[PDB]
Scaffold this active site. Structure first.
Site, mmCIF file in Angstrom:
data_model
loop_
_atom_site.group_PDB
_atom_site.id
_atom_site.type_symbol
_atom_site.label_atom_id
_atom_site.label_comp_id
_atom_site.label_asym_id
_atom_site.label_seq_id
_atom_site.Cartn_x
_atom_site.Cartn_y
_atom_site.Cartn_z
ATOM 1 N N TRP A 94 0.901 -1.177 -0.216
ATOM 2 C CA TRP A 94 0.042 0.100 -0.049
ATOM 3 C C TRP A 94 0.900 1.327 -0.084
ATOM 4 O O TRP A 94 0.234 2.512 -0.337
ATOM 5 C CB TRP A 94 -0.966 -0.020 1.161
ATOM 6 C CG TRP A 94 -1.968 -1.048 1.235
ATOM 7 C CD1 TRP A 94 -1.995 -2.044 2.215
ATOM 8 C CD2 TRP A 94 -3.073 -1.632 0.406
ATOM 9 N NE1 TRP A 94 -2.796 -3.160 1.833
ATOM 10 C CE2 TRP A 94 -3.629 -2.634 0.697
ATOM 11 C CE3 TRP A 94 -3.504 -0.810 -0.531
ATOM 12 C CZ2 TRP A 94 -4.711 -3.289 0.053
ATOM 13 C CZ3 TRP A 94 -4.576 -1.179 -1.183
ATOM 14 C CH2 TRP A 94 -5.199 -2.707 -0.986
ATOM 15 N N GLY B 26 -6.670 5.739 1.443
ATOM 16 C CA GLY B 26 -5.475 5.895 2.146
ATOM 17 C C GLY B 26 -5.781 7.149 3.116
ATOM 18 O O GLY B 26 -4.903 7.773 3.924
ATOM 19 N N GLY B 27 -7.014 6.888 3.756
ATOM 20 C CA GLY B 27 -7.387 8.053 4.874
ATOM 21 C C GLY B 27 -7.272 9.481 4.436
ATOM 22 O O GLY B 27 -7.208 10.316 5.329
ATOM 23 N N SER C 281 -12.698 3.018 0.065
ATOM 24 C CA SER C 281 -12.193 3.842 1.517
ATOM 25 C C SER C 281 -12.344 5.429 1.198
ATOM 26 O O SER C 281 -13.399 5.680 0.932
ATOM 27 C CB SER C 281 -10.877 3.184 2.231
ATOM 28 O OG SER C 281 -10.703 3.564 3.408
ATOM 29 N N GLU D 23 -14.194 -5.655 7.333
ATOM 30 C CA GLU D 23 -13.637 -4.430 7.410
ATOM 31 C C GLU D 23 -12.878 -4.004 8.346
ATOM 32 O O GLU D 23 -11.670 -3.320 8.220
ATOM 33 C CB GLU D 23 -14.618 -3.275 7.514
ATOM 34 C CG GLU D 23 -15.694 -3.540 6.099
ATOM 35 C CD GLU D 23 -14.875 -2.888 4.753
ATOM 36 O OE1 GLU D 23 -13.866 -2.492 4.866
ATOM 37 O OE2 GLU D 23 -15.762 -3.113 3.943
ATOM 38 N N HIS E 62 -10.382 -5.198 5.030
ATOM 39 C CA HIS E 62 -10.703 -4.114 4.237
ATOM 40 C C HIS E 62 -9.328 -3.982 3.059
ATOM 41 O O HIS E 62 -8.199 -3.903 3.488
ATOM 42 C CB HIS E 62 -10.288 -2.937 5.268
ATOM 43 C CG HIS E 62 -10.377 -1.513 4.759
ATOM 44 N ND1 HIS E 62 -11.541 -0.779 4.651
ATOM 45 C CD2 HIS E 62 -9.222 -0.674 4.525
ATOM 46 C CE1 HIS E 62 -11.202 0.083 4.189
ATOM 47 N NE2 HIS E 62 -9.883 0.473 4.059
HETATM 48 P P1 LIG Z 1 -9.428 4.284 4.147
HETATM 49 C C1 LIG Z 1 -8.202 2.921 4.348
HETATM 50 O O1 LIG Z 1 -8.911 5.092 3.259
HETATM 51 O O2 LIG Z 1 -9.806 4.503 5.396
HETATM 52 C C2 LIG Z 1 -9.687 5.697 6.291
HETATM 53 C C3 LIG Z 1 -9.447 5.491 7.418
HETATM 54 C C4 LIG Z 1 -9.037 6.566 8.079
HETATM 55 C C5 LIG Z 1 -10.683 4.918 8.267
HETATM 56 CA CA LIG Z 2 -5.867 0.238 2.538
#
Ligand SMILES: *[P@@](C)(=O)OCC(C)C
Ligand SMILES: [Ca+2]
Ligand SMILES: *[C@@H]1O[C@H](CO[C@H]2O[C@@H](C)[C@@H](O)[C@@H](O)[C@@H]2O)[C@@H](O[C@@H]2O[C@H](CO)[C@@H](O)[C@H](O)[C@H]2NC(C)=O)[C@H](O)[C@H]1NC(C)=O
Ligand SMILES: *[C@@H]1O[C@H](CO[C@H]2O[C@@H](C)[C@@H](O)[C@@H](O)[C@@H]2O)[C@@H](O[C@@H]2O[C@H](CO)[C@@H](O)[C@H](O)[C@H]2NC(C)=O)[C@H](O)[C@H]1NC(C)=O
Ligand SMILES: *[C@@H]1O[C@H](CO[C@H]2O[C@@H](C)[C@@H](O)[C@@H](O)[C@@H]2O)[C@@H](O[C@@H]2O[C@H](CO)[C@@H](O)[C@H](O)[C@H]2NC(C)=O)[C@H](O)[C@H]1NC(C)=O
Ligand SMILES: *[C@H]1O[C@H](CO[C@H]2O[C@@H](C)[C@@H](O)[C@@H](O)[C@@H]2O)[C@@H](O[C@@H]2O[C@H](CO)[C@@H](O)[C@H](O)[C@H]2NC(C)=O)[C@H](O)[C@H]1NC(C)=O
Ligand SMILES: *[C@H]1O[C@H](CO[C@H]2O[C@@H](C)[C@@H](O)[C@@H](O)[C@@H]2O)[C@@H](O[C@@H]2O[C@H](CO)[C@@H](O)[C@H](O)[C@H]2NC(C)=O)[C@H](O)[C@H]1NC(C)=O
Ligand SMILES: *[C@H]1O[C@H](CO[C@H]2O[C@@H](C)[C@@H](O)[C@@H](O)[C@@H]2O)[C@@H](O[C@@H]2O[C@H](CO)[C@@H](O)[C@H](O)[C@H]2NC(C)=O)[C@H](O)[C@H]1NC(C)=O
Ligand SMILES: *[C@@H]1O[C@H](CO)[C@@H](O)[C@H](O)[C@H]1NC(C)=O
Ligand SMILES: *[C@@H]1O[C@H](CO)[C@@H](O)[C@H](O)[C@H]1NC(C)=O
Ligand SMILES: *[C@@H]1O[C@H](CO)[C@@H](O)[C@H](O)[C@H]1NC(C)=O
Ligand SMILES: *[C@@H]1O[C@H](CO)[C@@H](O)[C@H](O)[C@H]1NC(C)=O
Ligand SMILES: *[C@@H]1O[C@H](CO)[C@@H](O)[C@H](O)[C@H]1NC(C)=O
Ligand SMILES: *[C@@H]1O[C@H](CO)[C@@H](O)[C@H](O)[C@H]1NC(C)=O
Ligand SMILES: *[C@@H]1O[C@H](CO)[C@@H](O)[C@H](O)[C@H]1NC(C)=O
Ligand SMILES: *[C@@H]1O[C@H](CO)[C@@H](O)[C@H](O)[C@H]1NC(C)=O
Ligand SMILES: *[C@@H]1O[C@H](CO)[C@@H](O)[C@H](O)[C@H]1NC(C)=O
Ligand SMILES: *[C@@H]1O[C@H](CO)[C@@H](O)[C@H](O)[C@H]1NC(C)=O
Ligand SMILES: *[C@@H]1O[C@H](CO)[C@@H](O)[C@H](O)[C@H]1NC(C)=O
Ligand SMILES: *[C@@H]1O[C@H](CO)[C@@H](O)[C@H](O)[C@H]1NC(C)=O
Ligand SMILES: *[P@@](C)(=O)OCC(C)C
Ligand SMILES: *[P@@](C)(=O)OCC(C)C
Ligand SMILES: [Br-]
Ligand SMILES: [Br-]
Ligand SMILES: [Br-]
Ligand SMILES: [Ca+2]
Ligand SMILES: [Ca+2]
Ligand SMILES: [Ca+2]
Ligand SMILES: [Ca+2]
Ligand SMILES: [Ca+2]
Ligand SMILES: [Ca+2]
Ligand SMILES: [Ca+2]
Ligand SMILES: [Ca+2]
Ligand SMILES: [Cl-]
Ligand SMILES: [Cl-]
Ligand SMILES: [Cl-]
Ligand code: NA
Ligand code: NA
Ligand code: NA
Ligand code: NA
EC number: 3.1.1.8
Lengths: 527, 527, 527
Positions: free
Chosen positions: C80, C114-115, C196, C323, C436
């Site tokens: 990742w 990627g959050g 995500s 997840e 996830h």
């Molecule tokens: P996705 C892996 O982009 O999830 C966000 C995470 C900060 C809950």
């Molecule tokens: Ca991921």
């Protein structure tokens, strides 16, 4: 001094006092080239343009036509005869506008009847000044050619293509699209209305694709094109055109030559021979009427109606309680305006032969059978009343209800009325009841004039009809919302609600003439 | 220093601190030619253009108007009196925008009430800065002409056609269409809101075709045009215009000359005679109000409503629990803001004569009969409370519910509220309850200002109403979605759900005043 | 040699062999000005134009970002991490087209997760060449800025307005509108898909009015903007921006000066301090994410969703069976990728404190109560499994189902899936189940490559998902019509049907996690 600039030039109108206010009337504005000489029998040609002020201050010439001479001196017939000079030079129209000049007024365009053989827009009963005063609508009416001069057909040939008088009506509709905003009208809110052949004409504009964008909605008084007199077959039109030629000494081999010969005839010789183009007419004969020309009318209109090929919009349709009586005193034996016309079974039988000349013996007996089962006292008037109902049901009432059903089945709101008030001033005798043509004066608001000797109940009936008609034109809904009036329900297939118009009390009823119209509509066409 | 380029030229605004943020206010931008001299009584003429920076940094002149002098020194009445100079030169508007400048903000346009005789956009309770701060909407308000100067009518005559002040409102709506994107507003998301005559005005913009494209949706607080004070008949307008002439020494024979004379009068002489153009007024008199002019209003508005001729969009409509009380202390006998106004049957009877002067004895008895069947203890306040309910039901609540039903029957979502919170700061006495006009400060978010001594429950009620109003304007749905609030159901014919607005608990209820409104709506109009 | 003329200049691509055919790949096309120097923290500026052939033959720089160093050498985490150089100069996109060049191909645009702190379009699992080969679609993916560099917000200030990385995504959508027909794509058939934070991003484009015309439909894999990590409050954004300033020695009084100071910092110093802008994070922390900026997002997105303010179109939404497991090995006590993580009640309790740091004791007990009622054998894995379900239900599954319900209530077709296949190649241990991120390789068709050691059942599952996704993009209906597959029913309020994706047998099920989601959705938000 009130002058309006139109696309073709200036027009001067005249002021009228109506009910303590003013209406401006522009009478006799031309809307086409005079259809004379080489233009006779052709589609109306568009107007050239003028420079100067065209004075629109008197009714124009009525179109050439034969005249009703059956009762000279008698107001009952003579009120329908033309009241301006007859001339081929007759393509003019009238405009009545409220004063002061409205800003964006709904437009009502009247198309007169007369069997497609007669009529003129200048009759007293068509005077649009009361509607302009009272409802602040603009009212327009046009003269259109009638008889062979209006409807001679050699179909496919542009020298005499047919439907010329319907094209005259259409070209007047176009004039209103191009010009009416100058007068304060809204070209986007135009309702056609008409009676008898004027109503059949209105119904054909719902079918004609070149009329689709020239109006918004439609009112049909005692007429629709599916009535048995309203449309001539191709077969009968050719036969009648060549019968006309034979009679005028114009039989030729090249058909363009027949027409050219017919163009050299005095208009009187054409008029004098019109009656004879048919081997036997009836009082209801329409010798020269609408045809399927492939232009105004693209297909047999019964097919267009049935298959939903018409302008999708609201309609208001109605008939009078005694449509057929007027015709009985023009030739049915034992009838007379000057007595009570108590006729015998033998006379009734003779009368069917007068009204149904091409019909088989079995056909005529089936009519006798359907109409003579009484009901029951004998009742000397039995046969007199039955003959009026035969004629009224066959020619007016069942085709109007059939038109209204088939039109409403395609999703549009339709409102149907049954007019059952006999005018207190009617010059025709009582037995003739609520005759054909005698709602018209109520629609144009003549009883609003207190000086005229209509009763007070009639003034009220007229005021209410005037309001319903105007609400229909403006809003597509012929309600009278302020005076606790009976609500007018839409006419639907299945329930078939209609509204009765009378001086006493408006009623909602269902399935007008159900048993009679089943006869004319499903059985008689087979005979 | 914040300067905006408009179609007519530059305008400088001023910054305001509101709740630890900033709002930019442009107060007093002109939107029409000053309507003076030859322009008095005419439709607002469009603005010429300027070059230089127009300083929009103070409220402009309020329009000429009579003032409420019944309780001098008393905040309850005086808060409604104008707080800027009176002048004919009064056609200006205010714009409040969030800071920083929004990108495409919904626009709320306030139209004040005052009976069409009074009012101004600069009152404290109409200050749009709190809504711009809290909801990030742009708020606009305009001054429009009131009294004879705004609504004198000689109808059809462009020297005094009627509805001039409604045309002033419309021309301000146009200004927002042309200019508001420069300020960061979305001309495609504009909601009109208004109270009392400002609400009746909003309802007439739903009917006027020249307003259809100037806004998206509408909010009506305690008013709609079907209220019995909201629209003047043609008959009563002519009578009042000529009564005005008689009183000012301007009776002439040419009507254009009457108006010309009226144009030479000091505005004070016109104002001083306004009260007398009617033989007997009431505290609810609207001597010079909207008329059917054939321009702004094309037909009687009851007819347009009933027949569905209006802008199809969502509406939010409501009323206050004690609409009628405010009017009782302006002339009903035995009433007083300074005592509990326990009145007798005789006083109640006298009070009906004060509020229903043209009404027959039977009409007044029918009111007494409907309202005095108790219910049951006697209850010294019985007659005092009944008179407030008579006035509030007849004038405000039943017409609002009737408007809401008829509007929703044509397919659009409608939301109805019943405001039942009495302001803790109300200077009027308790018996007057939740008065007419006293939701306004909740709608404009005045209780959000903690420095102002409203209770905490009021701050919360206001915040929630502010959010519902803003959600209505932005999204057509007056929900408060984040705080577990009662869902506001659409008002439909049949169920008639409404939402109560109070400090304790929001409730969904049905058929507000069902029994009372049946009386006023179906029976009283016959009397 | 394959060269395409774009609006900004020529681009050379490269040919690829895929499954005995060819795909043309254009990797690293720029779509904005590099956002450096004065452009750092600002909205992407449009591209200047070039002349010469831009060689699009390798992946471009990934955006600056912190990297996952918790398991160095371990493919499960490292797959990742970014696989091209990190640079602020990172605004590039990739285009994969079928060969020969399609005529009017549907376009799939991938937005990575990627959050919002991490990610890049060049990862192996996002390689669009298999979809272009097999389904003949065009696949597009862009790099967008992440972390403070992408989402720092001082809201209202254009030096750092917030949502810059969402604007980077939008500007790439615009590039596809302007350029994709040159590559053989249909700009009128574009489906966004993302996982995500890439799925939360896709959901925000449904809300943003500047994205409405840049795409046709949407796919959301394990994310939606109503998830509790997806949107930062105005309050927390300001606090975090000023916390960032404090940490970098950039506290100033003029806020435009804070940003100017922040523009002089090495990108490393910004990255190093990002983790600390919050007093306590969790493994799920999104320190710099989407905010309500008044530009990209006009209002709180929960309000837009609830009140139906979003693009009306079809959606495909889904989640994976486990997840929450991935997050447990980044700090929950007793968890480890290298053992079975059988944890105690005490450890579970500690784990809630790790995942719900700002939450009251009662809030945390309510979670324990809802999740620890077994069900029943004891079952050493009870607490381990419950903690994964707490995290997965709260953060991913209940918000996705809630988004899907509220979206479908406004009339559009919605399809929901539950992915329950564990990849035979998964490097993470078994207890972590269907993690996830591990549907992604099935969606991009990596198991279609027989050389890769996926099982045959996986090749079939992938082929079928690839076909459903492509049918969704092309036709708005994610059916696999040729192989007797289970029909995928629309997800409606009331029934809530979803489709399970697995290697064995596709099932239609109802009301995924009904009891759990009632807890998170209706009760937990109150705590
Ligand atoms: P996705 C892996 O982009 O999830 C966000 C995470 C900060 C809950
Ligand atoms: Ca991921
Ligand atoms: C009603 O009158 C008709 C119509 O014809 C007549 O008009 C009358 C008012 C009167 O002037 C009469 O002389 C005139 O002919 C009467 O029918 C006619 O009567 C005769 C026999 O008496 C027949 O041979 C005629 O052909 C017939 N005319 C027509 C057109 O049918 C009718 O009998 C009379 N009805 C009454 C009085 O009840
Ligand atoms: C409430 O007051 C009214 C109103 O008029 C009065 O205002 C009072 C507060 C006080 O200053 C009083 O002197 C003043 O006139 C009272 O009604 C009035 O009372 C008299 C007879 O006592 C009548 O003849 C008046 O016409 C009448 N005025 C009006 C306008 O109706 C009223 O009685 C009082 N009610 C109470 C105390 O319950
Ligand atoms: C699974 O491992 C964890 C995680 O931490 C450990 O990783 C192991 C594989 C091993 O290398 C170990 O030495 C390493 O610390 C174990 O929990 C840890 O155990 C100790 C006490 O023995 C605690 O004090 C630690 O804080 C704790 N670490 C964390 C992060 O919680 C865990 O017990 C083990 N579970 C098993 C074997 O079932
Ligand atoms: C159409 O064509 C013929 C034409 O016959 C007519 O000659 C015309 C010029 C005219 O004067 C008209 O009155 C005359 O009828 C029709 O033939 C008629 O039919 C009868 C028998 O019914 C024969 O005797 C004649 O051919 C002729 N009639 C007369 C009295 O002389 C024919 O009926 C018609 N076609 C139709 C109606 O479809
Ligand atoms: C509208 O017209 C007349 C006008 O009467 C008025 O004269 C005005 C200039 C003004 O001062 C006003 O106060 C005065 O009323 C109205 O006639 C009134 O009616 C009464 C009986 O009700 C008669 O006595 C007078 O003609 C006049 N009143 C007075 C007190 O002198 C008329 O009522 C009105 N029309 C309406 C209301 O429809
Ligand atoms: C946002 O503002 C303050 C800022 O506090 C922070 O200072 C930053 C520069 C950063 O290093 C960060 O780790 C530090 O927390 C937050 O205040 C914190 O709250 C605690 C108690 O919870 C206090 O001790 C301090 O003020 C501070 N923490 C520490 C450990 O020093 C504040 O919580 C936050 N606002 C929010 C989250 O809404
Ligand atoms: C039209 O009428 C007016 C009469 O007022 C006249 O001046 C003008 O000459 C007329 N035009 C004619 C008769 O052509
Ligand atoms: C008249 O009304 C129509 C709608 O029926 C509108 O489009 C038109 O512009 C109006 N014209 C006017 C007021 O001049
Ligand atoms: C008939 O004569 C007309 C006009 O004189 C001519 O134009 C036409 O072509 C001719 N047609 C036939 C078939 O004789
Ligand atoms: C309604 O009623 C009034 C008064 O009662 C009457 O004079 C008027 O003619 C009516 N209006 C209509 C449209 O029928
Ligand atoms: C507008 O206001 C500013 C005050 O800051 C001033 O410079 C300018 O002259 C003003 N315009 C006037 C008074 O017309
Ligand atoms: C504002 O929003 C409307 C839709 O309501 C849109 O058509 C318009 O172009 C927008 N303008 C902006 C963001 O400037
Ligand atoms: C009345 O006078 C005005 C203005 O002086 C004039 O324009 C108008 O034509 C006159 N009208 C009548 C009917 O006297
Ligand atoms: C919702 O609740 C919050 C906090 O509990 C409160 O401060 C705010 O005023 C409320 N918002 C609205 C729109 O009522
Ligand atoms: C693009 O690639 C080709 C290699 O085949 C080369 O001819 C051209 O110079 C390249 N452009 C560069 C390196 O900027
Ligand atoms: C691609 O398809 C669209 C409809 O989705 C059509 O409008 C467009 O012109 C097509 N372009 C081609 C085949 O180049
Ligand atoms: C702060 O400084 C900036 C840039 O140097 C300047 O443009 C701005 O107007 C200043 N604003 C304030 C409030 O100090
Ligand atoms: C359908 O079945 C065939 C042959 O049985 C298989 O090879 C192919 O992968 C399937 N297609 C899809 C889209 O699943
Ligand atoms: P309307 C009087 O025009 O009727 C036509 C007649 C010929 C049936
Ligand atoms: P609103 C206070 O403007 O009410 C009008 C009054 C005259 C009924
Ligand atoms: Br017999
Ligand atoms: Br009494
Ligand atoms: Br415990
Ligand atoms: Ca009858
Ligand atoms: Ca007639
Ligand atoms: Ca009636
Ligand atoms: Ca109450
Ligand atoms: Ca008030
Ligand atoms: Ca509540
Ligand atoms: Ca499961
Ligand atoms: Ca299957
Ligand atoms: Cl029935
Ligand atoms: Cl109920
Ligand atoms: Cl179920
Ligand atoms: Na008999
Ligand atoms: Na009593
Ligand atoms: Na246990
Ligand atoms: Na609980």
């Amino acid at each position: 001094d009130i002058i309006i600039a139109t696309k073709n030039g200036k027009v001067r109108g005249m002021q009228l006092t109506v009910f303590g206010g003013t209406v401006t009337a522009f009478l006799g504005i031309p809307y086409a080239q005079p259809p004379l000489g080489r233009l006779r029998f052709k589609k109306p040609q568009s107007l050239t343009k003028w420079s100067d002020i065209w004075n629109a201050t008197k009714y124009a010439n009525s179109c050439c036509q034969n005249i009703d001479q059956s009762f000279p001196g008698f107001h009952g017939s003579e009120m329908w005869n033309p009241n301006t000079d007859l001339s081929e030079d007759c393509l003019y129209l009238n405009v009545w506008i409220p004063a002061p000049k409205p800003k964006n007024a709904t437009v009502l365009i009247w198309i007169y009847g007369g069997g497609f053989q007669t009529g003129t827009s200048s009759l007293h009963v068509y005077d649009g000044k009361f509607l302009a005063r009272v409802e602040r609508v603009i009212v327009v009416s046009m003269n259109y050619r009638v008889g062979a001069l209006g409807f001679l057909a050699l179909p496919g040939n542009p020298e005499a293509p047919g439907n010329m008088g319907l094209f005259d009506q259409q070209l007047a509709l176009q004039w209103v699209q191009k010009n009416i905003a100058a007068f304060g009208g809204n070209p986007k809110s135009v309702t056609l209305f008409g009676e008898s052949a004027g109503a059949a004409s209105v119904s054909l504009h719902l079918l004609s694709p070149g009329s689709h964008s020239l109006f918004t909605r439609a009112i049909l008084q005692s007429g629709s094109f599916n009535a048995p007199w309203a449309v001539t077959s191709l077969y009968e039109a050719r036969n009648r055109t060549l019968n006309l030629a034979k009679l005028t000494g114009c039989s030729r081999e090249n058909e363009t030559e027949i027409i050219k010969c017919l163009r050299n005839k005095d208009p009187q010789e054409i008029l004098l021979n019109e009656a004879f183009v048919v081997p036997y007419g009836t009082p209801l004969s329409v010798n020269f009427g609408p045809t399927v020309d492939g232009d105004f009318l693209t297909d047999m209109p019964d097919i267009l109606l049935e298959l939903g090929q018409f302008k999708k919009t609201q309609i208001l349709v109605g008939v009078n309680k005694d449509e057929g009586t007027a015709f009985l005193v023009y030739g049915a034996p034992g009838f007379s305006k000057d007595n009570n016309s108590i006729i015998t079974r033998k006379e009734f039988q003779e009368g069917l032969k007068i009204f149904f000349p091409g019909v088989s013996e079995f056909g005529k007996e089936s009519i006798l059978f359907h109409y003579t089962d009484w009901v029951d006292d004998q009742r000397p008037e039995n046969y007199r009343e039955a003959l009026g109902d035969v004629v009224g049901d066959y020619n007016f009432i069942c085709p109007a209800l059939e038109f209204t059903k088939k039109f409403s089945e395609w999703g549009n709101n339709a409102f149907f009325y049954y007019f059952e008030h006999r005018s207190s001033k009617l010059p025709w005798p009582e037995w003739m009841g609520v005759m054909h043509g005698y709602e018209i004066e109520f629609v144009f608001g003549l009883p609003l004039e207190r000086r005229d000797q209509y009763t007070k109940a009639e003034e009220i009936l007229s005021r209410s009809i005037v309001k319903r008609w105007a609400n229909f034109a403006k809003y597509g809904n012929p309600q009278e919302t302020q005076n606790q009036s009976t609500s007018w329900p839409v006419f639907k297939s299945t329930e078939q609600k209609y509204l009765t118009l009378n001086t006493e009390s408006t009623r909602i009823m269902t399935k007008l003439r159900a048993q009679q119209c089943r006869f004319w509509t499903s059985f008689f066409p087979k005979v």
